Structures are given as structure tokens and as C-alpha cells.
Amino acid sequence: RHKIXXXLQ
Amino acid sequence: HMLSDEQMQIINSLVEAHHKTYDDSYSDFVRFRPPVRRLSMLPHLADLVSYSIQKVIGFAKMIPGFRDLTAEDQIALLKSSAIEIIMLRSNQSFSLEDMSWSCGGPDFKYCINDVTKAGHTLELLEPLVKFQVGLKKLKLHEEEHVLLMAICLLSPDRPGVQDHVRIEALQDRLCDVLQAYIRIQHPGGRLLYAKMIQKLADLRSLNEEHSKQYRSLSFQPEHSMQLTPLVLEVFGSEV
Lengths: 9, 239
Ligand SMILES: C=C1/C(=C\C=C2/CCC[C@]3(C)[C@@H]([C@H](C)CCCC(C)(C)O)CC[C@@H]23)C[C@@H](O)C[C@@H]1O
Hints:
The complex is a heterodimer.
Chain A: no helix or strand
Chain B: H1 5-21, H2 42-62, H3 71-89, E1 94-95, E2 100-102, E3 109-110, H4 112-116, H5 122-137, H6 142-153, H7 164-185, H8 192-218, H9 221-224, H10 229-234
Antiparallel strand pairs in B: 1-2, 2-3
The structure holds the ligand C=C1/C(=C\C=C2/CCC[C@]3(C)[C@@H]([C@H](C)CCCC(C)(C)O)CC[C@@H]23)C[C@@H](O)C[C@@H]1O.
Main location (chain B): nucleus
GO molecular function, one term (chain B): nuclear receptor activity
GO biological process, one term (chain B): intracellular receptor signaling pathway
């Protein structure tokens, strides 16, 4: 649950 | 001819981007779960891969113009290419005298029998060693190795990529920076660009095999529980 990939922001 | 003021700034940036994201000391390795000599090496190697996935994300963000695609395109290129970048960046620790990646510590020297104890077979590992020995033999300069990674990352022919037109453009802009660099700055590399492009096609074959083998490992809860959240998200089937 909730993509690590905002490690974009 | 020479390299232009703009192509060299691409070179310098890509190089510093690799310097910031690749620790020659390997000192962050003790913070991983230890290596152990079924699948004793999975926790340590899962930790190692999860770490370098974070590094590759950092590298990408500094590639000239990556920071300007759709966040979705960024993630699609990063997910689909991460394992190839990792195979690429790892050549920096692959010594041919030892046919292993020696990482500044004997607890961190990974021979082929180590990676079998993390789930993978020779159908992957032997093409992989041959890739690294072929790539090490090309005695690349730093700017070539780093350019090769950025060109690998910026392929527009990966699942999920939307603005193919533009990803194509920036990758082409780096292919030509690279190709100029080899022509102008590398004595005796009259064929070398072509050797590097073949290495990209190698990477796709191994990506395919890893994917196949990873999927088998990740579908058993026994072993998926030993992976990390970042590894499961990136090498995972979820769109
Ligand atoms: C990572 C890096 C290094 C080695 C890469 C290796 C060595 C061990 C075995 C590896 C990790 C391969 C394994 C098949 C990866 C399997 C991943 C998993 C078990 C989760 O499915 C791929 C690259 C190989 C060390 C240093 O170069 C940092 C770099 O960045």
C-alpha cells in the first residue's frame, strides 16, 4: 500500500 | 572534431551523478542483513539489490532531462530497467582475476555459488558472468560506463513508457555524446560503440531470465517475506 517509487520526490 | 560545451556538461554531470550514487568504499554493506554460507544468501542479496535500486533512482534523477519526463514515464523506465542498471553498475566490483564481485570485504565477495543460494540458477548466472567478463574486457573509461548506464535507462522501448517520442530524443542525445566521445577521446576504439550496443542487448536477455526466475521466487511466501518493500514493488507485476 502506497508506492515507495513519489523515494521521485 | 571535438565535444561541444553542451555535450561535455552532459558528461561531467553523468559522472558526478555516478560518483554521488556509487560508494567505492562499500561501507554501507555492514548495515545489510549478513550473508550466510535453503536460500541463506537471499536476505543479504535482497538487501544489496534493494540498496542499489535506491542508488539507481538517484542516478536517474541526475541524468540530464530525466527530471522532466512525466513522473509515470520516470517510474516505468526505472522499474523496467533497474535490474539492468544494477548488472551494469556492478561491473565496477567484478574482478576477472577472481570471477566474482569482491566488495571491499571477504564477507562481501560474491561468487556464483553465493547467488545460487539466493534462488537463481546457472541459466541466469552463467550468461551473467559472461556478460560481466565481456564488459570488463572492454576496459571502458568512466564516461563510457556512465554514458552506457544512462542510455540503458533512457530506452523508450520498455513496458509502460508513454511519451516514447521524447524518451527516444534524450536517449539519442546521449548515444551521440557517447559516440562522439569514443571517436574523439578513445585511442583504438574504432568499433567500441557497437560493442557497447551489443551489451545493451545482452542486458535484455538477462533481464528476461531474472524476471522469469524472480517471479518463481517471489510467488512463495517463504521467500517473498525475505525480500524488501522496495524490491517487491520494483520487480513486481503491479501496474
Ligand atoms: C548490486 C551491485 C553489486 C553486485 C551485483 C551483483 C553481485 C551479487 C549477485 C547479483 C546481485 C545479481 C543477482 C542475480 C540479483 C538477484 C536479486 C533478487 C535475489 C532479489 O532476485 C544481480 C547483480 C549481482 C555490488 C556493487 O557493485 C554494488 C552494485 O549495485
